[PDB]
Ligand binder design. Structure first.
Ligand code: HEM
Ligand SMILES: CCOc1ccc(C(=O)O)cc1
Ligand SMILES: [Cl-]
Length: 393
């Protein structure tokens, strides 16, 4: 009943151009079996959405990578939020939700915006820049570690640590095994900075620790929650902003619409998240026999959700392959959906918004003027290098 496919969604060939293979995965059926890794796959919007929204049947506590925590040792202590199910999940989630709240956004907004304006000003002085190193990396590096309350020393460990985390959700290919074999210094650094004494007052980190006396989390839980933010909070935004600039570079008509109305910045970023889906994939594990899209899946099976594919499913989206900054994006699954839906999305959107606003007001054109190089990662989609010429407005 379930078609079997030999496509490796974690191969460099796939990362290099995933879209044909994603259509093959969607059109093969609502549920496929991926023989390469012995997992089920869902690539259409409807099934991806259904799976995300049934956490009881499709759990996270057995890991959201290929590895089944019931069978293998997790490479690091499990995340108390990403790799937990309700009810264990519920209070740590509530804490990070309050730490990364509307009120918090109000306190950091002017600073994040000034930094974005300053960066664009600097880049315009240079003219010819690398929009990855000099913008998509440099801008989040200039605001997020400080917002966390990290010391200056050791920050060069943060992106390596993130690349390791997102590679480790993958199968045991070379990407994953190389990451893990280089991991020790990055782990050591990150774990140390998660301790209360090492986090500056007023940062996200200290704020997590301040929540330890409410009964929601205990003091021994706070370091792992800080670890979640240091895992997820940077490299995601790097690839989101990189995606947005790439889109604007490839669709000059949309840059021009954004210039004429900079208040489109926020949606222009959201559309970039749907269109590129910097977070491509996550797994769930079935806790029982389940029927999905008229197909039956046994208990304890890994299920691979293609978020990027769901965000380009023509069953859900009109002209999915077009970057449209006035699209109604609501419902896209680039931040996930349901109880695990990105708890940091207000930070991601804030960063993305103020950067695209700065570009909207200051830049007249973005032209690719060098070879584009992709960055390969088992979970993240994005570029290594994006050489562009920026023309001032
Ligand atoms: C454009 C940037 C980002 C994208 C595309 C993104 C994507 C996602 C996705 C798809 C999930 C769902 C995982 C699942 O269902 O298993 C998620 C969860 C999560 N994200 Fe984000 N993320 C981004 C930025 C951030 C930022 C900036 C932070 C923190 C400051 C963050 C922290 C987290 C955490 C802690 C979770 C786990 C939430 C839970 O399990 O309840 N992310 N993110
Ligand atoms: C795209 C979401 O990525 C992550 C990665 C790690 C964690 C965590 O360590 O809790 C959460 C989300
Ligand atoms: Cl670690």
């Amino acid at each position: 009943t379930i078609p079997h496919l030999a496509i490796d969604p974690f191969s460099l060939d796939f990362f290099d151009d995933p879209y044909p293979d994603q259509q093959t995965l969607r059109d093969a059926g609502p549920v496929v079996y991926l023989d390469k890794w012995n997992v089920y796959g869902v690539a259409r919007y409807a099934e991806v959405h259904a799976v995300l929204n049934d956490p009881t049947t499709f759990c996270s506590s057995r890991g959201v990578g290929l590895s089944d925590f019931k069978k293998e040792k997790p490479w690091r202590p499990p995340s108390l939020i990403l790799e937990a199910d309700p009810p264990a999940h519920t209070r740590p989630r509530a804490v990070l939700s309050k730490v990364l709240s509307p009120a918090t956004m109000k306190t950091i907004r002017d600073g994040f915006a000034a930094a974005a304006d300053a960066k664009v000003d600097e880049l315009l002085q240079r003219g010819c820049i690398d929009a990855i190193a000099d913008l998509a990396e440099a801008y989040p590096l200039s605001v997020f570690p400080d917002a966390m309350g990290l010391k200056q020393e050791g920050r060069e460990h943060l992106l390596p640590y993130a690349g390791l985390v997102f590679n480790a959700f993958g199968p045991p290919n070379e990407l994953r095994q190389t990451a893990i074999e280089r991991s020790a210094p990055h782990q050591a650094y990150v774990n140390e900075q998660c301790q209360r004494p090492n986090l500056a007052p007023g940062g996200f980190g200290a704020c997590i620790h301040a929540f330890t006396d409410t009964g929601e989390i205990t003091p021994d839980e706070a370091p792992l929650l800080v670890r979640s933010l240091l895992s997820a909070g940077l490299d995601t935004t790097v690839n989101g902003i990189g995606a947005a600039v790439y889109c604007l570079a490839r669709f000059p008509g949309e840059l021009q619409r954004l210039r004429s109305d900079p208040t489109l910045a926020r949606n222009a970023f959201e559309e970039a998240v749907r269109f590129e889906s910097p977070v491509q994939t996550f797994f769930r594990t079935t806790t029982r026999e389940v029927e999905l899209g008229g197909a039956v899946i046994g208990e304890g099976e890994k299920v691979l959700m293609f978020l990027g594919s769901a965000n380009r499913d023509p069953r859900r989206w009109s002209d999915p392959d077009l970057y449209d900054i006035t699209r109604k994006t609501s419902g896209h699954v680039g931040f996930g959906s349901g109880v695990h839906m990105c708890v940091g999305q207000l930070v991601a959107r804030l960063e993305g918004e103020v950067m695209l606003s700065a570009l909207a007001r200051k830049v007249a054109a973005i032209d690719i003027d060098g070879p584009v190089k992709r960055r390969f990662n088992n979970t993240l989609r994005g570029l290594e290098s994006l050489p562009v010429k920026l023309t001032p407005a």
